[PDB]
Scaffold this active site. Structure first.
Site, PDB file in Angstrom:
ATOM      1  N   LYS A 172       0.826  -1.220   0.000  1.00  0.00           N
ATOM      2  CA  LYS A 172       0.000   0.000   0.000  1.00  0.00           C
ATOM      3  C   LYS A 172       0.860   1.270   0.000  1.00  0.00           C
ATOM      4  O   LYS A 172       0.539   2.228  -0.717  1.00  0.00           O
ATOM      5  CB  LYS A 172      -0.933  -0.038   1.230  1.00  0.00           C
TER       6      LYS A 172
ATOM      7  N   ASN B 293      -6.798  -3.250  -3.611  1.00  0.00           N
ATOM      8  CA  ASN B 293      -6.742  -3.052  -2.151  1.00  0.00           C
ATOM      9  C   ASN B 293      -6.831  -1.583  -1.761  1.00  0.00           C
ATOM     10  O   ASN B 293      -6.357  -1.184  -0.684  1.00  0.00           O
ATOM     11  CB  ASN B 293      -5.476  -3.660  -1.519  1.00  0.00           C
TER      12      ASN B 293
ATOM     13  N   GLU C 255     -10.441 -10.678  -1.464  1.00  0.00           N
ATOM     14  CA  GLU C 255     -10.353 -12.053  -1.938  1.00  0.00           C
ATOM     15  C   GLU C 255     -10.750 -13.028  -0.822  1.00  0.00           C
ATOM     16  O   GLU C 255     -10.329 -12.954   0.316  1.00  0.00           O
ATOM     17  CB  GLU C 255      -8.894 -12.345  -2.385  1.00  0.00           C
TER      18      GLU C 255
END
Ligand code: 7JF
Ligand code: SAH
Ligand code: CL
Ligand code: MG
Length: 213
Positions: free
Chosen positions: A142, A168, A197
């Site tokens: 991230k 994400n 997921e």
């Protein structure tokens, strides 16, 4: 053995050699029934498939390979001659990804690059003979999304119409990257809401299309 090695062995024993779709299904089954893992998965994978089919990219860069799930998913939809480059910092994951691609019969379409994205991106033009990228899948870590996006621009790797697709952006979340691309006149952004997921948890993909400097 590791979870990643167990996933690869499960594929090798439960999928059809040379059949990418059977490899994806085997991974999804293992990760649903046995052990969760951070593959993009089927719900978000269906959105990625739609994107790949829309743009038919000739050259894709993936940031973060893991076990090769997303690489299999994208490479199976590329046209003859089209290529994927995937960067992976963890050498054990790089070796599992190579073996997964070989099992799937996709090894001629993909090159795995060993190393950290921030070190490899500046080598793409001279070392790896890249001009510009058609698509980038951001799915590494991230906190690297915004810095690596800015690096790709600095290095001259984006062109008008390059598609960035980021996983994400909700879980764990990428607030600096989202704020930046959605506030910049250099990107045209769309959000695709989906699910983490293998979980009943909301997550999403961001598409950010580069519009030039
Ligand atoms: O790091 C990642 N890269 C790429 N894709 C990821 C992905 O698709 C994920 F779903 C997760 C995830 C999200 C929620 C969760 F609970 C666990 C892991 C991670 C991740 C996030 C935070 C970590 F501390 C460790 C892993 C990643
Ligand atoms: N700076 C970096 N450069 C390259 N790979 C990195 C990185 N930081 C983390 N990674 C790698 O990014 C991966 C995240 S998981 C990738 C999942 C894959 N795209 C799929 O959907 O199947 C891990 O394997 C991790 O080792
Ligand atoms: Cl899923
Ligand atoms: Mg992810």
């Amino acid at each position: 053995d590791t979870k990643e090695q167990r996933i690869l062995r499960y594929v090798q024993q439960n999928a059809k050699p040379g059949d990418p779709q059977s490899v994806l299904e085997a991974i999804d089954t293992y990760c649903t029934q046995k052990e969760w893992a951070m593959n993009v998965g089927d719900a978000k994978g269906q959105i990625m498939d739609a994107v790949i089919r829309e743009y038919s990219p000739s050259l894709v860069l993936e940031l973060g390979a893991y076990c090769g799930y997303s690489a299999v998913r994208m490479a199976r939809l590329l046209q003859p001659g089209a290529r994927l480059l995937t960067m992976e910092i963890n050498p054990d994951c790089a070796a599992i990804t190579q073996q997964m691609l070989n099992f799937a019969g996709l090894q001629d379409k993909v090159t795995i690059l060993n190393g950290a994205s921030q070190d490899l991106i500046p080598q793409l033009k001279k070392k790896y003979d890249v001009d510009t990228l058609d698509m980038v899948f951001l799915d590494h870590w991230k906190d690297r999304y915004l810095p690596d996006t800015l690096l790709l621009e600095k290095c001259g790797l984006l062109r008008k119409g390059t598609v960035l697709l980021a996983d994400n952006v909700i879980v764990p979340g990428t607030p600096d990257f989202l704020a930046y691309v959605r506030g910049s006149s250099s990107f045209e952004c769309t959000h695709y809401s989906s699910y983490l997921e293998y979980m009943k948890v909301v997550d999403g993909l961001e598409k950010a299309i580069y519009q030039g400097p």
